Design a protein around this ligand. Structure first.
Ligand code: YIZ
Ligand code: K
Ligand code: K
Ligand code: ZN
Length: 357
């Protein structure tokens, strides 16, 4: 029972040259890596090497136009980097951004291959920039290519096209790119939990609402769990996993589990405003390990409080390594609004998932 880990400091080169304090900091991944060292987690892992994704692997999910444009930014002067970045919603670009997005995706491909060939049971990928807001034809929300989506398609390309992949997105934002890439696809189940507030939270679209259940053959295979009405924490996330995430996942029976693991729902993050604890994330990980014979890959997305993301992702790697789940703090009763959300998702997905109660 071996846990893999992939990290490469070259992904720190991506940076905002007009705001050195932009929250999507190079030091996100370095701080996480150091905490793994300090807690003696890194030494217990098998170290998976990082690599560049190829242009053909990007074509698994992204259009040739979008690859061509981001690729061209490697040679742009700062004035053009600024112009191009402003053509997207919430994007900054440097000369290293294209290469770092390649490394993030390729690092995850290597970890998926390591899991699928039996070299490791599960794995953690400490990567940046994130991916789950990137769509087929455009970058968005600090994301250039959709790393989690590309990894699912990569996993299928090296096994069989019908490989059942579950993607759990517990980043506090809706992974619009991941939903849309797989919207008509019943081979990849997308489950996202996210702050919604009636469509006023980034990325500010009703695409994130519970009633978007998929299209065509993929009806039932897109599960949005939207939060309305202020701060949520461990009790709401534990209830959502108990009533929705784990019953649907068990009925889907994935062969590989990818976590789009933002840590911006963590206590202390200003961009999320939630208070999921490191012990909370440990329990979420431990539940997911009961699926897919333990084939779980945890992929960093967002998460912007440096101390919070370091403690929270370390807690996840500790669970993958087999440590006992930590004792949870007091679980306050479910906020009425959280009950409403879980009930809305249950009602919307009752047709597709016979397990639901
Ligand atoms: C200031 C602001 O709200 N900018 C928009 C925005 C915010 C967060 C993300 C993200 O990726 N979070 O994990 C992306 C875009
Ligand atoms: K999410
Ligand atoms: K789907
Ligand atoms: Zn986020």
């Amino acid at each position: 029972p071996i846990t893999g880990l992939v990290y490469d400091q070259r992904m720190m080169l991506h940076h905002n040259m007009w705001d050195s304090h932009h929250p999507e900091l190079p030091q996100r991944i370095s701080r996480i890596f150091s905490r793994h060292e300090e807690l003696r987690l890194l030494s217990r892992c098998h170290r998976i090497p990082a690599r560049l994704a190829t242009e053909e692997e990007l074509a698994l999910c992204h259009s040739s136009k979008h690859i061509s444009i981001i690729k061209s930014s490697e040679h742009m002067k700062p004035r053009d980097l600024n112009r191009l970045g402003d053509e997207y919603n919430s994007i900054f670009i440097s000369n290293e951004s294209y290469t770092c997005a390649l490394l993030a995706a390729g690092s995850c491909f290597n970890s998926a291959q390591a899991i699928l060939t039996g070299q490791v049971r599960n794995a953690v990928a400490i990567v940046r920039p994130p991916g789950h807001h990137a769509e087929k034809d455009t970058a968005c929300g600090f994301c250039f290519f959709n790393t989690a989506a590309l990894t699912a398609r990569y996993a299928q390309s090296i096994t069989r096209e019908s490989l059942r992949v579950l993607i759990v997105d517990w980043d506090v934002h809706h992974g619009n790119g991941t939903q849309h890439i797989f919207e008509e696809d019943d081979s990849v189940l997308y489950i996202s939990l996210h702050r919604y507030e009636d469509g006023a939270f980034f990325p500010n679209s009703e695409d994130a609402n519970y009633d978007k259940v998929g299209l065509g053959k993929g009806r039932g295979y897109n599960v949005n769990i939207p939060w309305n009405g202020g701060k949520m924490g461990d009790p709401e996330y534990m209830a959502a996993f108990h009533h929705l995430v784990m019953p649907i996942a068990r009925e889907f029976a994935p062969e590989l589990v990818l976590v789009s693991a933002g840590f911006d729902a963590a206590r202390g993050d200003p961009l999320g405003g939630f208070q999921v604890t490191p012990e909370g994330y440990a329990h979420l990980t431990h539940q997911l390990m009961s699926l897919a014979a333990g084939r779980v890959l945890i992929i960093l997305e967002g998460g912007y409080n440096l101390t919070s993301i370091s403690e929270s992702m370390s807690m996840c790697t500790s669970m993958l390594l087999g440590d006992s789940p930590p004792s949870l703090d007091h679980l306050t009763p479910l906020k009425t609004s959280a009950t409403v959300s879980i009930n809305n998702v249950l009602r919307a997905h009752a047709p597709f998932w016979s397990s639901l109660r």
